[PDB]
Design an enzyme around this catalytic site. Sequence first.
Site, PDB file in Angstrom:
ATOM      1  CB  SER A  23      -0.952  -0.019   1.170  1.00 17.21           C
ATOM      2  OG  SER A  23      -1.688  -1.237   1.201  1.00 17.21           O
ATOM      3  CB  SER A 101       0.988  -4.818   2.107  1.00 19.87           C
ATOM      4  OG  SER A 101       1.970  -4.489   3.057  1.00 19.87           O
ATOM      5  CG  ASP A 156       3.549  -8.515   9.331  1.00 19.52           C
ATOM      6  OD1 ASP A 156       2.545  -7.815   9.590  1.00 19.52           O
ATOM      7  OD2 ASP A 156       4.020  -8.657   8.189  1.00 19.52           O
ATOM      8  CG  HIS A 169       3.564  -4.666   7.462  1.00 21.08           C
ATOM      9  ND1 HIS A 169       3.486  -5.819   6.705  1.00 21.08           N
ATOM     10  CD2 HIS A 169       2.786  -3.759   6.848  1.00 21.08           C
ATOM     11  CE1 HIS A 169       2.671  -5.610   5.680  1.00 21.08           C
ATOM     12  NE2 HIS A 169       2.241  -4.364   5.742  1.00 21.08           N
TER      13      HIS A 169
END
Length: 189
Positions: A23, A101, A156, A169
């Site tokens: 993202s 992601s 994560d 992450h």
Amino acid sequence: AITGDELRTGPCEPITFIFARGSTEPGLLGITTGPGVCNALKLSRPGQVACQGVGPAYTADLASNFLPQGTSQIAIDEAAGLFKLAASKCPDTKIVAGGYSQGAAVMHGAIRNLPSNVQNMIKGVVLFGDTRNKQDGGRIPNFPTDRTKIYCAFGDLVCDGTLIITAAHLSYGDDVPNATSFLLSKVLE
């Protein structure tokens, strides 16, 4: 000839890598893993690899994370398209895919409904910080599991349904060399 656009804007190559960024990453490949995995692949296999990012349709906007499939259809449809494009343009290319992601979500959804023609060209898939790890049970629906590897860092929590952002992450930088080896394992010379 263009970076991240080598499938669209270049000649056919023995190996084609297709990546979907996480993202809010800029560009087609982003700046985190795909950039790495890309150069890493070209280095380890000079003269053979063309990287293609997934965009610009896949906007990698945040809000698409909350959609049922965890990204946009347009995004998935885009990825789907490029896999096929490879099949059409370069039927002898060995495809390898990647995602981080929401980009993993893109791939999760694009790869699951590709015909066997196209799926069988995908030798290896790598997914970092997969936002669909729990919704799909640590695999891609309808895609051989031995060809898949998922990097889920300790801490994560996006690997477990949520969209919580931790320093774990943001660590998949460290997994490029391993991810690359995985891909390369499958794509033998």
